[PDB]
Amino acid sequence: ALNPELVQAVQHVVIGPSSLIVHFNEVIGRGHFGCVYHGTLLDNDGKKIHCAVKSLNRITDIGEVSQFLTEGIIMKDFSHPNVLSLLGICLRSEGSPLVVLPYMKHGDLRNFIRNETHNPTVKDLIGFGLQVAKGMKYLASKKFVHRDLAARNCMLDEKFTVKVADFGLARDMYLPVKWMALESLQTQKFTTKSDVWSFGVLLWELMTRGAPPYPDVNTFDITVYLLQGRRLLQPEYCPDPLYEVMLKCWHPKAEMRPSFSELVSRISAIFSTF
């Protein structure tokens, strides 16, 4: 019942069921990421690729299926070393459509840095910040606004490569007012400059090794608190030039904040001093 030219257009994103083994009997992340399962993807050469398979239970009618094909076509053009890629999509005869993602061995970045077992250095933490900045620079270059950037929404692969996630077909893996720019709190509109604000908060989470921001301020009171000029304080083991970068991200004037290219330039120079 689907439109044939749309079916043709999505072909390059479609993973055939003979290319994929899904283990619907073993979930990833104890259900905390929703209906996400271990899977094995067979590439053109027959190489076995460990993947994360999400079942899209929200899709029922043919109209929802059609919009889903588009989201897949759009996100398949989005690939960068610091952005979570889309491996492909599955259109099943019986059962919900599937989203196929690369497996992220060390899960989300917030839980990784919060874990007592892991001891990342100040340099390693700065390195994660630089990787996120690189991923965001790529997104911003394609005029893509994330809207929910935070350490909880970045993943870490087996090589400790940070991937900006929670966007496109990788969203809803389960308002973020304490990560939101002052103008987003006032207007409910999001821009790349509001993403820069959220990046600033993410850098603070990195340097505090996952501490929650403004723990004594209600989500309702955040607007007034920011209007008074109060900002997150300098973390104990945060280099002064990197705290200046964080403060730049939270400038009340969106146009005054650094671009993601500026952030990459400035943070790489800080990383290189260590």
Ligand X SMILES: Cc1c[nH]c2ncc(-c3c[nH]c4c3CNC4=O)cc12
Asked if residue 135 belongs to a known ligand binding site, the reply is: no
Contact present, 168 and 153 (Cβ < 8 Å): no
Binding mask 65-104 for ligand X (x = CB under 6 A): ------------------------------------xxxx
The binder of ligand X chosen from 86, 90, 154, 165 (CB under 6 A) = 165
45 is catalytic: no
Number of residues that bind ligand X (CB under 6 A): 14
Burial class (CB within 10 angstroms; exposed 0-12, middle 13-18, buried 19+) of 114: middle
Ligand-binding site membership of 107 (annotated):
no
Flag whether 28 is marked binding.
Answer: yes
Cβ distance to ligand X smaller for residue 103 or 250: 103
What is the rounded CA–CA span in Å between residue 250 and residue 244? Answer: 10
29 makes contact with ligand X (CB under 6 A): yes
Please report whether residue 204 would count as binding ligand X according to CB under 6 A: no
Choosing from 61, 148, 195, 240, the catalytic residue is: 148
CA quadruple 72, 75, 77, 79: dihedral sign: negative
Shorter beta-carbon distance to ligand X: residue 101 or 201: 101
| Cβ-contact 21, 40 below 8 angstroms | yes
Choose between 113 and 165: whose C-beta lies nearer to ligand X: 165
Residue of 146, 149, 76, 143 whose CA lies nearest to 110: 149
Place of tokens 């950037």: 149
CA distance 232 to 230: 7
33 is in an annotated binding site: yes
Nearer to ligand X, 170 or 226 (CB): 170
Spatial distance between the Cα atoms of 223 and 72, rounded to a whole number of angstroms: 36
For residue 1 the two structure tokens come to 């019942």
Interface with ligand X includes 28 (CB under 6 A)? yes
| Closer residue to ligand X (CB): 102 or 129 | 102
- Residue in 15, 20, 33, 232 binding ligand X, rule: CB under 6 A: 33
Strand 48-55 to strand 88-90: parallel, antiparallel, or no bridges (unpaired)? unpaired
**105 labelled binding-site residue:** no
Q: Hey, what are 138's tokens?
A: 């790529």
Single residue of 22, 133, 155, 263 touching ligand X by CB under 6 A: 155
- Find the binder of ligand X among 86, 100, 173, 246 (CB under 6 A): 173
The two structure tokens encoding residue 168: 């496109």
**38 assigned binding-site residue:** no
Closest CA to 113 of 218, 224, 203: 203
Among positions 13, 15, 41, 52, the unique one binding ligand X when judged by CB under 6 A: 52
Annotation: binding site for ATP: 28-36, 54
What residues make contact with ligand X under the rule CB under 6 A? 28-29, 33, 52, 101-104, 107-108, 155, 165, 170, 173
